[model samples]
Target chain A: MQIFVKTLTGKTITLEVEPSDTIENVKAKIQDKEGIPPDQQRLIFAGRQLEDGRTLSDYNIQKESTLHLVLRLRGG
Target chain B: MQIFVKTLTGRTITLEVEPSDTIENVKAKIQDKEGIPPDQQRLIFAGRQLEDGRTLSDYNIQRESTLHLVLRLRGG
Candidate 1:
């Protein structure tokens, strides 16, 4: 399965994913591809913000699903 | 009661709040004080991302508690 991400900067990135893939894993991929760190990424799918420690299946995200990716501001 | 917010820019802001206050209320306050819109804010407490519809008590946020505020990207 692949998750299609639409970023804030108007860029789109596709990540290979699985139902069992953790949100953290997806964040890592975003980090590698988009240069946004895992902790600084907030992913939203189906109008719900995804959380770490949860799997993609937990949110019912499917193949070719489009999700919004936002850069999370890091607290100082 | 008050909640202390630490931003990524290393600034701390205090928010007057009540246990019954919804996260949306806090986000409104943040917008007023910090200029970040409600929908662009992601509040994190104790390592959990706060949701807009949930009340402060729902997450056990209390007086003098400290939370992190991150700016969420607006996907294009």
Candidate 2:
């Protein structure tokens, strides 16, 4: 499925992953695509946590839908 | 201590709390100030969880220093 991901920095990225993909897996993909560390991340769907190790199903992520992980408040 | 807080919707609010204050306590204050529900809240300081009950001292909040608690997004 194609997931439209929004980074905290306001960048939009698209990646394909299986429905069973974990939030961590998406993090890894984001790192591969953006060169950022996963630990410096918080994946949010709507207004809730897409916590580490939680699967897409846990956040009720539908197939081929967008996921919005609000941006990190990084740097001074 | 005087904490300069920035809400998620880009508003600045200052609050004076004792040396000991919980994230929930601040949430209550925000509710009184902004009319938002505390349970529908996520308090982030420097991009980390302000887990409920964790004291400002535990979070290393300094006296007279500023903190930016991003807004708790609500409604669809």
Candidate 3:
């Protein structure tokens, strides 16, 4: 199934993921694409943060649903 | 506008992109999502292959349009 992810820049990248995939794995997938480390990535869904140990189904994630990506920005 | 890409695995990822963006850039975008290198990725549209130097508008790619993705699979 397919999913959508939006960046703070408003650019959206679609990801094909399983409901069984852990948020940690999802972050790793994101890391592969975005070149950002999983530990520094934060994913938001349903207006709240997602936990690494949890699966998408833990929150009942749906296909074509949009997820927000927040980078761990550092100080200037 | 929004576009969708389907993998050989039958998984699809939707991308929000500009028609002005080059196909090369689009593949880079795909790389960010699928962990596939741009050089190893093949994008298909309108039942034909898309060229890297061409813009989406060169083929008149439309919103909600679907593009098929092929990988340069390695030998067994």
Best by lDDT: 1
Q: Clashing pairs in model 2?
A: A8-A71, B8-B71
Q: Give one digit per residue, the lDDT tens place, for model 1 in B1-76.
A: 8666766544667788988999998899988977898988988754568999999889765465556678789779
True contacts kept of 1: 0.00
Please, what is the TM-score per model? 0.49, 0.45, 0.47
- lDDT per residue as tens, model 3, B27-64: 89888877789888877653467889999989866566
Local lDDT at A67 for model 3: 71
Minimum summed lDDT over a 10-residue window in model 1 chain B is located at B59-68
Candidate 3's TM-score: 0.47
Instruction: Tell me the TM-score of model 2.
Output: 0.45
Sort all candidates by lDDT, best to worst. 1, 3, 2
Worst 10 residues of 3 chain B by lDDT: B3-12
* Chain B TM-score (each prediction, in order): 0.91, 0.77, 0.88
What's the distance in Å from true for residue A30, model 1?
36
RMSD of each: 14.3, 14.0, 16.3
Alpha-carbon runs more than 4 Å astray in model 2: A71-76, B1-76
Write the number of the candidate with greater TM-score, choosing between 1 and 3: 1
Error of 1 at A5 (Å): 38
What is the alpha-carbon interface RMSD for each candidate? Answer: 14.1, 12.9, 13.5
* lDDT (10s digit) by residue, model 1, range A1-76: 8767878887879999788999898888887887887776887643356779988656555565666676576677
Q: What is the lDDT of residue A28 in candidate 2?
A: 91
